[PDB]
Design a protein around this ligand. Structure first.
Ligand SMILES: Nc1ncnc2c1ncn2[C@@H]1O[C@H](COP(=O)(O)OP(=O)(O)O)[C@@H](O)[C@H]1O
Ligand SMILES: Nc1ncnc2c1ncn2[C@@H]1O[C@H](COP(=O)(O)OP(=O)(O)O)[C@@H](O)[C@H]1O
Ligand SMILES: [Mg+2]
Ligand SMILES: [Mg+2]
Lengths: 354, 354
C-alpha cells in the first residue's frame, strides 16, 4: 500500500551500541524511544519490503514469501498507527509496548518461513549463477534487517515493559567474553555427547593486550555472541568427531580470546580435517550443508551487525580456524544496515578463468 | 601513441597454461616456438593497452615511459619471428637468443615501475584503487611472461640449463619443507642484521594425502621461496619489535599440510597483530608501517607474494589477532593439472573497472 512506498523513501538510521546504552541506562526516556521507533521501524520494514518485490517471481509467489511479506506489511501498518498518537498519551506508550510484543511474536517465525521459500524455490527451479548470487545478497540483507529490528524493539520492550537487571535491555555493558565462550561450548558439548556419546574438550586461553592482567570485558549483546560461538562450536565438534571416527580420543577444540586496542578477536581451532579452498565460500551459502546451513551465514551477520566480522580459514587434511572479530569500543559498534536505494537496485571477464 | 602491432595483438585473449602443460613440453622446440612467438606479443600488447590508459601524469614518468618502450621493442623483436618456419633451426636458435635478450631487457622492469610510482607521488598510491588494480595486473603479467620465456630458455638453450632436477623452473618433486627451512634461513640472516636476533622456527607437517610420506608437489620453488621469504620477514620484524621487553623470543610456528586438493602452509607469530581495520591496507602496494628506506618499507612484500600464490590458482591470506599475533596462510593447488595461469585480459570489463 501507500505507506510501504512512502517510508521506503527514508533510509534507515543506524545506532551505535553506545547510543543504545547512553539511552536507556540512566535517562531512559520512554517518550523519546517511542517517537524514535514509531518512525524507524516502519522505515526499515518498508525498505526491505521494497527489496522483496525485486526477487524472482516464482520465489515471491511462494506461500512462504507471501507470508513474510504480509506479516511485514501488517506490522508496518500497526506501527504507523501510532504517528497519530502523542508521545505524552500513556495509553499510547503502553499500547506501543504491546504492539511491539505482538510484532515480535508475529516475526518469531520469519527466518524459517523465508528459509523455506528459498529451499522451495531452489529445489523447484533452475537458477542462473547471477540469480543465486542475488539470493545470497538478498538474504544477508533481509536477515540483517530482521536482526536490527529485533534488536531495537527488544531494547524498548525489555527496558519499558524486563529481563536481566545487570543488563540494559539485551546489552551487557560488561560482557564477560570468556564466560560466554564456556557457556556456548557447553550447549554444544551437550548436543555432541547426546548424539555421538563423545565430544572434544575445550582448551581456552586469553590475552588482554590492553591491561595484561585484566579479565576481558566489552560492551556487547551476549545473546548475539552466544549464537555465533554456539554455531562455530557445533561445526568444530561435528568435524572433529567425524574426522577422528577411528580414534580413541578427540583432539581438543582450542580457543583463544584476545582484546586489543580496537578489536576483540576469538579464534576457534579444530583438527577436524578442514575443507578444500575450493569449497570454503560455499560454506557461507545459505543452502549448503553436508540442521540447515544457516549457521555460518547468520553467525557472520551477527558479527557484522556492529561492524565486526567472521572468517573461516582451513588447512584441508588437518583442521579449521574460525575467527570472530568484534569492535572493542562501543562508539564504533554501529549498526550495519541495508538501505534500498539506487546503489542497491543497481546491484541486483576481468581475468582469465579456468 | 600506440603502434599498429600493439593494437592488433591486444585484440586477443592470453591463453592460460597449466603447470602440467608447462611440465610437458619439457618431456618439442618447434611447438613451443610456434606458441610463444604468438602468445608473448598477445600478453605484452594486452598490458601495453592498460598502461596506455594509466594516469597521464604516471604514464609520463621516465620510468613508465621507459618500461613501455621496452615492452614495445620486445613485442616487435618477437613479431619479427612470425615469418620464419618453426622447423628453421637458425630461427629456433635465434629465437632462444631473443628470449634471453628480452628477459635481460625486462630484468629491471619491477624496480623501474616501482620507482615511477615514487615519482608519481602529486597523489596517494595506497588509496588510489585504480593504481592498485593496475599494479596487480601489470606484475602478474610480468610474472607470467618471465615464466613462459624462462621455461623455453632453460629447456632449449645451449648455455642456460638451470637446475638439472628441474624441468625449466619447475620442480616436479618440490620438497616444500626444504624450501620453508631455506626461506626461513634467509629471513633469519636479514633479521639478525637489523636486530642482532631473530625468532626460531618451529615446524610441523601433516601429509593427509600420503600419510607419513614427505610432502611433494609440482611447483616453481623460486616462487614459493619468494612468498615464504616475504612472510617470514614480516613475522620476524613483528615478533622482535613486539617482544623486545621479554627475555626471549617466541618462535615462529609453521605448519605444512598436504590435502587432497590443496597444499596449505600456515605461518603463525606472536608479534602483536594488527587491527582488522588496516588488514586490507596491508596488501596495498607501498603500504608500510616502517619508514621507506632492506627488511621493510617499500610495502611490496604482501601484494607480490599474494600474486605468486594466485598466479597458479592458489591464494594468500592474513588473519590477525590484534594484541597477540598474526596467522599468514598460503594455499597452493596440489594437482599440477589444476594449477592454471591466472592472467589479466584487457577488454570491455577491464576497461569498465578504471
Ligand atoms: N570447523 C569446520 N570443519 C569442517 N567443515 C566445517 C566447519 N565449519 C563448517 N563446516 C562445513 O561447512 C558447512 C556449513 O555449516 P553451517 O553453515 O553451519 O550449516 P550446517 O551446520 O547445518 O551444516 C557444514 O555442513 C560443513 O560441511
Ligand atoms: N606478521 C605480521 N604481523 C604484524 N604486522 C604485519 C605482518 N605482516 C605484515 N604486517 C604489516 O603490514 C605491512 C605490510 O607488509 P609488506 O606489504 O610486506 O611491506 P613492508 O614489509 O615493506 O612493510 C607491514 O609494514 C606491517 O606493518
Ligand atoms: Mg552449524
Ligand atoms: Mg615484508
Amino acid at each position: 500500500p501507500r505507506e510501504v512506498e512512502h517510508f521506503s523513501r527514508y533510509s534507515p538510521s543506524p545506532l551505535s551500541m553506545k547510543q543504545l546504552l547512553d539511552f536507556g541506562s540512566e535517562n531512559a526516556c520512554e517518550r523519546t524511544s517511542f517517537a524514535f521507533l514509531r518512525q524507524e521501524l516502519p522505515v526499515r520494514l518498508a525498505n526491505i519490503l521494497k527489496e522483496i518485490d525485486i526477487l524472482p517471481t516464482q520465489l515471491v509467489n511462494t506461500s512462504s514469501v507471501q507470508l513474510v511479506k504480509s506479516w511485514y506489511i501488517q506490522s508496518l501498518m500497526d506501527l504507523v498507527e501510532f504517528h497519530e498518537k502523542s508521545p505524552d498519551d500513556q495509553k499510547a506508550l503502553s499500547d506501543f509496548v504491546d504492539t511491539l510484543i505482538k510484532v515480535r511474536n508475529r516475526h518469531h517465525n520469519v527466518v524459517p518461513t523465508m528459509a523455506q521459500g528459498i529451499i522451495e524455490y531452489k529445489d523447484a527451479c533452475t537458477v542462473d549463477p547471477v540469480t543465486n548470487q542475488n539470493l545470497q545478497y538478498f538474504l544477508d540483507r533481509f536477515y540483517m534487517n530482521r536482526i536490527s529490528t529485533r534488536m531495537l524493539m527488544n531494547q524498548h520492550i525489555l527496558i519499558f515493559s524486563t529481563g536481566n537487571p545487570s543488563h540494559i535491555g539485551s546489552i551487557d555493558p560488561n560482557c564477560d567474553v570468556v564466560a560466554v565462550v564456556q557457556d556456548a561450548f557447553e550447549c554444544s558439548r551437550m548436543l555432541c555427547d547426546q548424539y555421538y556419546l563423545s565430544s572434544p574438550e575445550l582448551k581456552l586461553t586469553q590475552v588482554n593486550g590492553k591491561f595484561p592482567d585484566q579479565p576481558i570485558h566489552i560492551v556487547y549483546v551476549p545473546s548475539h555472541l552466544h549464537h555465533m560461538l554456539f554455531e562455530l562450536f557445533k561445526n568444530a565438534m561435528r568435524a572433529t568427531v567425524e574426522h577422528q571416527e577411528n580414534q580413541p580420543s578427540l583432539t581438543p577444540i582450542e580457543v583463544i580470546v584476545v582484546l586489543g586496542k580496537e578489536d576483540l578477536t576469538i579464534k576457534i581451532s579444530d583438527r577436524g580435517g578442514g575443507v578444500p579452498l575450493r569449497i570454503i565460500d560455499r560454506l557461507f551459502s545459505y543452502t549448503y550443508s553436508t540442521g540447515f546451513g544457516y549457521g555460518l551465514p547468520i553467525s557472520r551477520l551477527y558479527a557484522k551487525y556492529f561492524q565486526g566480522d567472521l572468517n573461516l580459514y582451513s588447512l584441508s587434511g588437518y583442521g579449521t580456524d574460525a575467527i570472530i572479530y568484534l569492535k572493542a569500543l562501543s562508539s564504533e559498534s554501529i549498526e550495519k544496515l541495508p538501505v534500498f536505494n539506487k546503489s542497491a537496485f543497481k546491484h541486483y571477464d576481468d581475468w582469465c578463468i579456468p
